[PDB]
Structure formats: structure tokens, C-alpha cells
């Protein structure tokens, strides 16, 4: 079904510098002659972008993997239609569902399904003497299709059946983002011919599609099309048939951009915010022409590098268990009080109990109770029926809260309660606990 | 990609809890949203109060944490007639332990063995090394404290993006050149609409220079750019020669 064909040749890496490209509309609204400043996940104007070259025309075969890292600014130029699509997947097997984006002449298919890929997946086309036509029946990229999740079919885009000879290279420049379960593919089709693949002329991108799919992909692959060629026996050459390609990949860093909208709604140009101090002045005045003078742009501060904390090494524990392991509790009319001081005591152990019916706290949220520390810790205890446990709280009334034990309105602490009918009840009733019912 | 008649939620009137957040409960059907997220699960009745913003405990801390900026409804009702099994139902599970509290709306599915104690057990259950999942065990005899409660959480999304979900409303013609607020498949138009041009790239929907001059009537069948302007508000003054001179 599938044949494994690996290679030993590896190409060296290279890098270059982006100049101006990478500006897209950050919203679906229309603004004319406006200098709106938008904060978004853009890319810096002067950035380093990785440059890769595909199969070199004796022949060199390679297939690299590039990190995604919160979107990718992609640029490429091809004319032989060698690039058919991409496959995305952390493992690219039946363990997890895999994404396959394929563009062909008939249509474009985006399949999110579990596909069993090989070590070196590839796609091939051939020609039939009897059919007098070409077809693609070499589905060696995947072996089995199970656990189908998503299938999307769209009409082909950004492909023109134009036949010309000369330096008619066409530039394709996309931006990939994946946020909040939404995949956004911005693009700009601008045919520009120039010796260097990365031009200088400014351009503004537009949204193309939006896929409402949430998936995290770390490693991907870009496939290729192999055309079968009939050679004479004297040639004795076979095994690989493909073309050549190259592309640029850059990353996006979130920051603020002051963007100039043309009267037609397009973008004439834009200026970064943190590129240079002049750009900071240009952004802080929302203008492009700054007259001579001194402008206050922002503030600068020195950031701390480490945190310092110290406490005595004795760390003697205080009897938080004394007011919790106590066998007998005083009645509410004579509530017992226990002072806690000169100690260290965590409060996550109360969580480890998880046996409390009500752990409601006031003044200080107990998510990080142990973070701070206090002048004095007071432990009070009593026993009441679960009817009025709710009224032992700041600003509460009732006979229990008005005649026996009343919290202050500015109270700051936790209230802890549980059910213990096991330890303080007996057949015929337990009459040890008495509560005050009347008072002036 | 559909209209949502939320009035049927009140029509059933069989829901124990319906209290909503960040949007009017009764007149919910009168607006439109960028997207409608429907989350569904089943939990214990005594813990349904935990599915709410700013709530802490077991479920809201360890399985399904609702964000503070949540704008949507929360729904619950009894399920004994459909989810009670004699001898206890053990199909349902709820996570008991976590390394840390989940981020809002997160979805934790991993079944890695939890290390409750100080002795590492290299992902093998044993003493104080527990399987994080655990069954509810719905006894049909059990009272309202331990009943199986089905919960549906609707998470809306309000933005300026194309609203795919919308209320029923009605259908009638369109008028312009006279200031009037109305609706046309999700429009407000508090002002006078003119047959402007405002050449705009065929992907945008709204439009404003400072506050609002939106256009592009939201009808999928017909699109047209309609400027939005006020209808000549103005102060009024009075000239009087003097009450003791004339009238």
C-alpha cells in the first residue's frame, strides 16, 4: 500500500530581515481618514524571519518542521503547483485526530479526522494511455480513516489558469492565527516581480475565512506532488520527481500599532509603537508629522529581579488543632475563646479536611490565607443547631445572633461549621447544650 | 446559522434554576449574538449553586470553572425519571483532585493518577494514590440532596462581528430619508438613513469615524450601504421685547 523512501541530505538554514509587510485589518469595521491606534498580536516592523528552500534541482530531498508559537506570518512564491497542501498533528497517527488541508483544481478539502500517516507521506499523479488523461490515485499520505470529526469543502481560491513565459512570479503572503477556538487566515494576493522575494511596497491584508475549530498543533508537514515520467531503459533514473520552492516564516509579538486609514478605507501605511523613540512620539500624538520640540512620551522604571522574605527558623506550630480536636465545646451562651499567637500555622489543612458544611469567610478570601500574616489570630467556638448557622455572620440578626454571639459589622475572618450529631447526641436527647433565649 | 426562540425555555416552566447573568432573562429573544455556546453536563443538586461566576468548591474548582465576564444563562432541572438506576448509577463521574484550579471554561480530561501523598507512585494506583474520577452513585431513594441534576450553560458572545444567531422578530419593508429607529435582520438605525456611497471593501459590515455611522444592512439576501446621521436636533431660543412692554 505504501513504500518507505527516506533521504540522507539535509539543507542548511538561513535567515533574513522583514522590512514593512505584515499589516492586517484588526477589525471588521470601516474607518476613513482615521488614526485609530489598536492593540493586537501584530509583528514588529524590523524582525528576523527564517528563510527555507525546497527541493533543489543531482537532486536534494528534505522536509523540515517549524514551530507554530502563536500564529505564523507566511510568505511564499510558487508557479509549478508542486505544493498541494499541509498536514497538521502532534503525532499524525490514530492516537489523535489530524488536520489535512488540500487544495486541488476541482475543489479544496479541509478534513479533521484520524489519519494514519507514514514516515514520508507524499502524493502522486500519473497519466493513463487508455483514459487519455491524468489522475491522482496515489493516496499514500494516509492509510486508514477512522473517527471522522470534521469535513469542509470549499471552492478553490487564489489560482488563475494563466499561461505566460518570463519573470511573472506571483507573491502569496498569509497570516495564521489561532485564538478562542477560531482559526483566522488573513491573506493578500499581490503579484509583484522583483529579484528579491521579499518586496518593499506596503500592503494591507484582509480577512479571508474563519474556522470555528479549537485544536493545538505543534508540528506540521507540507506535502508535494510527484508526476510520473516515462523514461527509456538507457536513462536508468527514477525515484524522485519534483520541483523547487522557497518561503519565509516569521512570528507575531503582541503590541500597539497606530494605523492610518485611507479615505477609501484601505491602509496607506502604519507605524510601530516600540520600534524607536520617534515612533513612540508619533504614537503618543496620534500624528505622522511631528514638529520640532521636546515631547514627553512615557515613563521608565527599574523592575525588581528577586523577592526577599525571612522569618524565624523555630517555626513552632500553634495549636490550631486544640480548638479543632477538642472533645467538648462550650454552649453558645458561654462561647469559649482561645488566643493564638507567636506561631506559624497553615490554613490549607482545613481544606484537606473537606468535612465542613460551611467554610464561608469574610474580609479575607481563603484562597491565599497563608500568604499574609496577622497581628493576632482569635479562635472562638460554640455549638448551635444547623438552623441558624447561617446567621453567625457579619450584619446578621436573629435570636442566636442577637442574644448569644454577634459578629461586628467590620469583622475580618473566617467562619467554620460542620455537623457533629454523632459526638454530642444520645437516645432521648442531649440536654448538655443550653442557649440564651431572652435578654433585655 | 439559525434563529433561536428562547421563549420556549419559559414555556416549559419545568426548570428548577434559570437565573441568568449579564443579559435580561425575560426579553432574551429580542437580540442577536456573535455565537451561542451550549455546554451540558450532569451534577448533584446540592452543587448546582456551584455552576456560577465567583463560586468555589469541588465542581467549580476542579471540573468546570465559569469566568467572571460570563454573559449568559445557567439552566438546571431534575432528571430522576430519566437518569435513575436501581442499585445506583455508576456511569457518571466527577473529578476529585487537581494539581491546580482550572482556567475559566477549561476542559480537563486526562486520567493521570493523582499523587495525594508524599510518596511518589510513578502513575500507579496504590496507597493514597487515587484514580481522580469517581462515581456519583444515584440512589433512586436518595432525596433532593443527592439527586442527578442536568445542567445546561448558555454562553453568549456580544461583539460587532456578524451575528449568526438572532431572534424571531418579524418581517416588513424598508424606509429611508426620515429619521426612525427600526430593525432589519439585526439593525438599530436610530437616525435618518441616506443612500450614500461610502466606498467600502466588500468584507466589512459596520462603519464609524468617532461613535457610529454604520451601514451595510444585515440582510443576507440584499446588501446596501446606508449612512446613519441624526435628524437635526437643536436648541430653541425666544425673543421677548419685555413682558411689561408687549406680549
Amino acid at each position, epitope marked *: 500500500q505504501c513504500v518507505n523512501l527516506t533521504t540522507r541530505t539535509q539543507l542548511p538554514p538561513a535567515y533574513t530581515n522583514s522590512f514593512t509587510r505584515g499589516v492586517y485589518y484588526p477589525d471588521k469595521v470601516f474607518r476613513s481618514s482615521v488614526l485609530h491606534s489598536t492593540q493586537d498580536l501584530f509583528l514588529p516592523f524590523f524582525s528576523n524571519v527564517t528563510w527555507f528552500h525546497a527541493i533543489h534541482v543531482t537532486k536534494r530531498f528534505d522536509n523540515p518542521v517549524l514551530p507554530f508559537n502563536d500564529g505564523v506570518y507566511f510568505a511564499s512564491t510558487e508557479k509549478s503547483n508542486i505544493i498541494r497542501g499541509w498536514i497538521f498533528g502532534t503525532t499524525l497517527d490514530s492516537k489523535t485526530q489530524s488536520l489535512l488541508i488540500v487544495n486541488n483544481a476541482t475543489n479544496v478539502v479541509i478534513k479533521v479526522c484520524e489519519f494514519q500517516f507514514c514516515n514520508d507521506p507524499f502524493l502522486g499523479v500519473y497519466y493513463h494511455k487508455n483514459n487519455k488523461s491524468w489522475m491522482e490515485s496515489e493516496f499514500r499520505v494516509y492509510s486508514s480513516a477512522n473517527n471522522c470529526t470534521f469535513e469542509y469543502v470549499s471552492q478553490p481560491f487564489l489560482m488563475d489558469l494563466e499561461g505566460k513565459q518570463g519573470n511573472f512570479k506571483n507573491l502569496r503572503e498569509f497570516v495564521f492565527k489561532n485564538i478562542d477556538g477560531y482559526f483566522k487566515i488573513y491573506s493578500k494576493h499581490t503579484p509583484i516581480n522583483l529579484v528579491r522575494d521579499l518586496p518593499q511596497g506596503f500592503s494591507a491584508l484582509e480577512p479571508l475565512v474563519d474556522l470555528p475549530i479549537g485544536i493545538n498543533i505543534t508540528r506540521f508537514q507540507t506535502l508535494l506532488a510527484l508526476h510520473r515520467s516515462y523514461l527509456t531503459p538507457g536513462d536508468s533514473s527514477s525515484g524522485w520527481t519534483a520541483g523547487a520552492a522557497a518561503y519565509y516564516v516569521g512570528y507575531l509579538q503582541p503590541r500597539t500599532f497606530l494605523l492610518k486609514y485611507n479615505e477609501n478605507g484601505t491602509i496607506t501605511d502604519a507605524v510601530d509603537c516600540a520600534l524607536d523613540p520617534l515612533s513612540e512620539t508619533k504614537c503618543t500624538l496620534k500624528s505622522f508629522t511631528v514638529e520640532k520640540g521636546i515631547y514627553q512620551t512615557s515613563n521608565f522604571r527599574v523592575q525588581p529581579t528577586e523577592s526577599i522574605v525571612r522569618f524565624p527558623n523555630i517555626t513552632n506550630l500553634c495549636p490550631f488543632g486544640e480548638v479543632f480536636n477538642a472533645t467538648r465545646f462550650a454552649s453558645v451562651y458561654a462561647w469559649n475563646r482561645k488566643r493564638i499567637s507567636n506561631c506559624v500555622a497553615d490554613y490549607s489543612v482545613l481544606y*484537606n479536611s473537606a468535612s465542613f458544611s460551611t467554610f464561608k469567610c469574610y474580609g479575607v478570601s481563603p484562597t491565599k490565607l497563608n500568604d499574609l500574616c496577622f497581628t493576632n489570630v482569635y479562635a472562638d467556638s460554640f455549638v448551635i443547631r444547623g438552623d441558624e448557622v447561617r446567621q453567625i455572620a457579619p450584619g446578621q440578626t436573629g435570636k442566636i445572633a442577637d442574644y448569644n454571639y454577634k459578629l461586628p459589622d467590620d469583622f475580618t475572618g473566617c467562619v467554620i461549621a460542620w455537623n457533629s450529631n454523632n459526638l454530642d447526641s444520645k437516645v432521648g436527647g442531649n440536654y448538655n447544650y443550653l442557649y440564651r433565649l431572652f435578654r433585655k | 446559522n439559525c434563529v433561536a426562540d428562547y421563549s420556549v425555555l419559559y414555556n416549559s416552566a419545568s426548570f428548577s434554576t434559570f437565573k441568568c447573568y449579564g443579559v435580561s432573562p425575560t426579553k432574551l429573544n429580542d437580540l442577536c449574538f456573535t455565537n451561542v455556546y451550549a455546554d451540558s453536563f450532569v451534577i448533584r443538586g446540592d452543587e448546582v449553586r456551584q455552576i456560577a461566576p465567583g463560586q468555589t468548591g469541588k465542581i467549580a474548582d476542579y471540573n468546570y470553572k465559569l469566568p467572571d465576564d460570563f454573559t449568559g444563562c445557567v439552566i438546571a432541572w431534575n432528571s430522576n425519571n430519566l437518569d435513575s438506576k436501581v442499585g445506583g448509577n455508576y456511569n457518571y463521574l466527577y473529578r476529585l483532585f487537581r494539581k491546580s484550579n482550572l482556567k475559566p471554561f477549561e476542559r480537563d480530561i486526562s486520567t493521570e493518577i493523582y499523587q495525594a501523598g508524599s510518596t511518589p507512585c510513578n502513575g500507579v494506583e*496504590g496507597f493514597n494514590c487515587y484514580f481522580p474520577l469517581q462515581s456519583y452513585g444515584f440512589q433512586p431513594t436518595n432525596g433532593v440532596g443527592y439527586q442527578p441534576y442536568r445542567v445546561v450553560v448558555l454562553s453568549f458572545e456580544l461583539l460587532h462581528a456578524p451575528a449568526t444567531v438572532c431572534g424571531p422578530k418579524k418581517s416588513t419593508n424598508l424606509v429611508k430619508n426620515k429619521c426612525v429607529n427600526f430593525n432589519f435582520n439585526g439593525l438599530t438605525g436610530t437616525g435618518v438613513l441616506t443612500e450614500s456611497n461610502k466606498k467600502f471593501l466588500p468584507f466589512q459590515q459596520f462603519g464609524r469615524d468617532i461613535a457610529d455611522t454604520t451601514d451595510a444592512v444585515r440582510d443576507p439576501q440584499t446588501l446596501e450601504i446606508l449612512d446613519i446621521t441624526p435628524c437635526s436636533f437643536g436648541g430653541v431660543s425666544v425673543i421677548t421685547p419685555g413682558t411689561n412692554t408687549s406680549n
Partner: nanobody
Amino acid sequence: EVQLVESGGGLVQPGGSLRLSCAASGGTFSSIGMGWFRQAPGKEREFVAAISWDGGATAYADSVKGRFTISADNSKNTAYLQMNSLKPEDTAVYYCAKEDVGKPFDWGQGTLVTVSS
């Protein structure tokens, strides 16, 4: 001295049943879970069963999967263990051990149980 009361240990025929109980009091009023271990003559200590004190989660060893039932009553503050299909190898001494938040597993004196016909 943390005292755990172990009851039910005694002689039992092969393929029988038993109900062992470990009762406790104290432990800073709050723990994380309770457990049962066993030690056979000529053999070291080994894990048998465990139940968390907060939830009903149960952990069983491979050699006792599906034939024991370990529960606990928080109100009674006592752990109960139900034994069925007593194999001859089960002859050992069983300990009830209480691990607490950052605390060892309270190791009682243990009780001897012998499987013989």
C-alpha cells in the same frame, strides 16, 4: 500515642468472609485518608486498600481487586473492610495506617488473621 482500635482479626476458613474495623480519634481532627496494609510471614509489608477521608474514592491492590470492599463512616470516624473469597495466602497480619496532610500513616499494633481449613 495515637491509638487505633483494630477489631475483627481472627481465624477464618478459606473462601470465607470477614469485617475488619479500624477506629480512630484525633489526628488534628482532620486527615486525608485511611488505609490497610498486610504483612505475611517471611514477607514484607505491602499495600492492600485505601479510602480517602474526604470523598468516597477507593483504591485496591491488584491482588485484592474486585473481592474486597473498603468504606468508612466519618460520623463514626471508623474505617470498615469487607473480605470475601479468602485465599489461603491471605494468612498474614493486617495493619490499619492513617496518612494525614504531611503526616505518616498511623501504624497500629496490627491484628493477625489466619486462613486455614
